[PDB]
Amino acid sequence: IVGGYTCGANTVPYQVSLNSGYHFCGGSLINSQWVVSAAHCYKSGIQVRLGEDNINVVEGNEQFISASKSIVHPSYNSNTLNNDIMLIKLKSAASLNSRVASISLPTSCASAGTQCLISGWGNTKSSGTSYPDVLKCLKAPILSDSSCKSAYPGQITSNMFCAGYLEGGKDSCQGDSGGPVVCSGKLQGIVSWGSGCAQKNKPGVYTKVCNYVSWIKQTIASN
Numbered sequence: 773i774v775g776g777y778t779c780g781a782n783t784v785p786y787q788v789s790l791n792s793g794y795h796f797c798g799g800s801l802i803n804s805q806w807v808v809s810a811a812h813c814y815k816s817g818i819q820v821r822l823g824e825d826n827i828n829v830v831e832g833n834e835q836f837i838s839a840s841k842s843i844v845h846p847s848y849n850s851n852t853l854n855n856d857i858m859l860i861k862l863k864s865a866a867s868l869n870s871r872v873a874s875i876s877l878p879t880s881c882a883s884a885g886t887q888c889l890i891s892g893w894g895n896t897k898s899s900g901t902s903y904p905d906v907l908k909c910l911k912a913p914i915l916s917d918s919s920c921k922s923a924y925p926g927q928i929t930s931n932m933f934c935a936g937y938l939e940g941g942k943d944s945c946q947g948d949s950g951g952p953v954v955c956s957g958k959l960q961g962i963v964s965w966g967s968g969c970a971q972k973n974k975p976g977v978y979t980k981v982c983n984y985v986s987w988i989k990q991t992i993a994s995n
């Protein structure tokens with residue numbers, strides 16, 4: 773996250789770190805046995821780390837659970853990143869409480885101007901790499917579809933939305949992929965792609981979760 777602040781330990785209880793010997797993507801806990809992340813974060817050998825703040829030190833509250841299966845959306849397109857969403861089932865259920873809790877799925881989509889919270893352990897520099905130890909947060913608004921399409925002509929599908937600042941300086945960045953975009957207590961987006969990090973006129977693009985609620989519910993119910 774570039775231009776963000778330190779969230780504070782366990783203040784984002786649904787945030788998870790996907791680990792393969794190092795942190796490579798974020799995710800969101802939606803129930804005790806399932807996490808939602810981005811399809812482009814897929815790989816085998818994923819260990820889900822819950823209740824984290826400093827990802828390089830065991831501080832207490834951490835729960836490390838292996839993924840039993842990962843389900844990439846059947847229509848995911850790696851070239852356009854359309855349908856960039858994946859579900860991960862945990863080998864055992866997580867222990868929920870105040871430091872580890874699930875986030876609710878939306879009932880309606882959010883409108884332009886809604887302020888959301890984006891969090892993650894991704895790069896904090898737009899020009900070069902600096903990865904933080906603790907979780908960073910950023911408050912960002914959802915932009916209008918016209919500003920989003922004017923920024924990325926021909927690349928925005930109806931399963932994506934832009935959030936951020938056109939002036940540059942504040943954005944999600946590499947390492948934040950797969951993580952949550954929460955607005956009014958509902959998971960509305962997943963960090964997906966953008967051009968560089970916090971560049972002027974190039975906001976971040978997020979997977980529009982409200983378009984997948986029935987798919988998520990139906991997939992969880994059958995697995």
Ligand SMILES: *C(=O)CCCC1CCNCC1
Pocket residue numbers: 894943944945946947948949950963964965966967968969970975976977
């Ligand atoms: C995931 O970490 C790949 C890059 C994610 C982009 C970075 C720029 N802001 C939008 C998300």
Ligand SMILES: [Ca+2]
Pocket residue numbers: 824825826827828829830831832834
């Ligand atoms: Ca830790």
